[PDB]
Amino acid sequence: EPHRFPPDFQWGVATSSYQIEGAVEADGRSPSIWDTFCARPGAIADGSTGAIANDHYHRYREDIAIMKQLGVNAYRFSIAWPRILPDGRGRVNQAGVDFYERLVDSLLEQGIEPYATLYHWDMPQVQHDRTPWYDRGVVDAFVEYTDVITRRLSDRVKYWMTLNEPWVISFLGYGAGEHAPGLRDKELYLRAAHHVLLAHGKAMPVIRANGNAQTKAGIVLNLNWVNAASDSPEDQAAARRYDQFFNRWFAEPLYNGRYPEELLEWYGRDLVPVQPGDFDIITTPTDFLAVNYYARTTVKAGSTDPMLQVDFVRPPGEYTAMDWEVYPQGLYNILNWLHTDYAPPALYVTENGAAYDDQVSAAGEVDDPQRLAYLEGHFEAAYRAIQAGIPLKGYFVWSLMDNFEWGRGFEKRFGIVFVDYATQQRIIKRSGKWFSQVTRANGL
Ligand SMILES: O[C@@H]1[C@@H](O)[C@H](O)OC[C@H]1O
Ligand SMILES: O[C@@H]1[C@@H](O)[C@H](O)OC[C@H]1O
Numbered sequence: 001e002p003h004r005f006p007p008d009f010q011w012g013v014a015t016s017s018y019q020i021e022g023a024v025e026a027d028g029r030s031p032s033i034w035d036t037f038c039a040r041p042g043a044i045a046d047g048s049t050g051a052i053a054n055d056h057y058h059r060y061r062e063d064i065a066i067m068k069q070l071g072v073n074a075y076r077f078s079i080a081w082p083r084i085l086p087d088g089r090g091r092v093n094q095a096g097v098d099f100y101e102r103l104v105d106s107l108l109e110q111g112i113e114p115y116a117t118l119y120h121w122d123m124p125q126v127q128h129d130r131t132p133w134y135d136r137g138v139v140d141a142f143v144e145y146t147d148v149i150t151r152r153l154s155d156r157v158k159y160w161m162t163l164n165e166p167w168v169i170s171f172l173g174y175g176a177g178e179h180a181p182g183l184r185d186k187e188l189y190l191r192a193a194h195h196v197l198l199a200h201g202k203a204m205p206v207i208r209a210n211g212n213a214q215t216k217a218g219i220v221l222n223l224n225w226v227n228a229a230s231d232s233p234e235d236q237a238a239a240r241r242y243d244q245f246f247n248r249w250f251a252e253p254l255y256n257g258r259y260p261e262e263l264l265e266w267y268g269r270d271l272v273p274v275q276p277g278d279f280d281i282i283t284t285p286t287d288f289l290a291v292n293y294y295a296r297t298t299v300k301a302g303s304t305d306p307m308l309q310v311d312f313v314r315p316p317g318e319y320t321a322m323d324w325e326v327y328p329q330g331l332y333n334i335l336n337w338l339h340t341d342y343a344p345p346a347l348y349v350t351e352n353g354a355a356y357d358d359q360v361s362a363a364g365e366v367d368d369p370q371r372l373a374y375l376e377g378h379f380e381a382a383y384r385a386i387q388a389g390i391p392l393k394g395y396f397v398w399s400l401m402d403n404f405e406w407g408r409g410f411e412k413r414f415g416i417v418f419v420d421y422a423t424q425q426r427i428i429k430r431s432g433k434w435f436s437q438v439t440r441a442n443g444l
Contacts (some may be wrong), residue, residue: 016081017083046411047409070400070416073111078119116159196250216291216346217286221251223332295330332384375434417429
């Protein structure tokens with residue numbers, strides 16, 4: 001009664017360049033804003049950096065053979081700007097383009113469809129020094145990079161995502177100081193949020209011009225299910241503000257050419273650097289909307305976040321090692337909201353997964369029953385979305401393998417494949433062996 005996904009459903013895994021590649025000085029790559037941020041005392045919980053990570057730069061063929069064992073028909077990765085244009089603009093680093101050619105050819109040779117993210121947070125440092133996200137000149141810098149890389153690969157890459165999680169780039173990078181470049185200012189976050197949207201909309205016709213009739217592109221939004229802690233008017237309004245901040249701030253511009261008006265007023269409307277024609281650019285038609293979903297966030301009126309006047313509440317329930325509530329209904333809820341309000345022609349889940357404490361048994365196995373249960377419940381929510389008529393075309397598990405989890409460093413393991421950092425040994429987890437069966441059965 002709750003069995004099979006559509007016959008051409010895309011089952012994948014996802015990664016990003018800085019989280020897995022390592023070889024940070026190899027083959028002409030220049031430092032990213034993350035290579036510099038990892039130097040800051042207190043920025044990374046375990047004091048780690050992405051300098052080596054999974055060494056996927058060297059080990060990609062072995063990682064693609066693991067993908068074949070998992071039976072995925074798709075693979076979501078990001079392209080490092082610092083390998084392609086190490087001076088940020090101008091001179092193409094041929095050897096960096098060459099890595100992504102070898103990666104894309106190794107994937108298509110194994111029948112794995114490439115889903116390429118253009119921007120997953122690793123701007124070159126030298127380019128951030130000229131154009132941070134809050135400087136409108138960042139838009140043409142991103143379009144130039146997009147132009148260069150899409151010209152080289154669009155014969156072989158059909159699916160293109162512009163930027164990964166505008167909320168993270170803007171708010172964690174410039175509003176909360178938790179991600180590179182590590183600034184913390186309401187105005188800088190709002191400028192960066194606007195310029196991310198404009199870089200999305202200006203990139204879109206360049207991806208299309210450099211491609212063919214098969215080329216599909218879209219943006220990737222992180223979205224979480226937001227819940228008021230109670231029916232108190234103060235708590236309902238706290239939830240609505242947080243929802244406006246987290247979920248609607250990017251979606252409303254993308255589909256309706258407006259920011260959420262109540263939150264825009266709350267902030268100071270003049271702080272957002274909107275020019276005439278900007279919403280026409282931001283609303284440029286997309287082929288799909290990609291969604292990164294992890295959790296339910298429960299909000300009360302409070303002062304924890306002084307910017308939004310909210311506190312977070314943990315309902316009784318199940319939490320990952322990140323302290324993120326496990327709420328698979330939230331994924332159905334988000335997909336249904338997007339379907340009803342915006343009618344994207346296609347939806348992808350480009351990230352969903354969990355971090356739990358993992359150990360290699362005496363027998364060399366990784367028994368992760370809480371990660372397996374996490375995935376089973378979310379896959380079941382996706383199946384329900386499809387049965388309700390929501391045009392969900394694919395699902396990418398975060399992550400293929402344990403990697404550098406940004407401010408959490410390597411202590412949080414998201415992989416369905418375990419990495420022994422002492423040896424770079426990959427061990428497919430119990431959750432990975434289970435997924436190996438889901439992909440092959442195309443269902444649960
Ligand atoms: O994507 C985001 C994560 O990387 C960070 O820890 O804070 C919020 C998340 O949704
Ligand atoms: O890259 C990932 C990000 O997109 C998600 O929200 O945060 C977890 C990271 O693993």
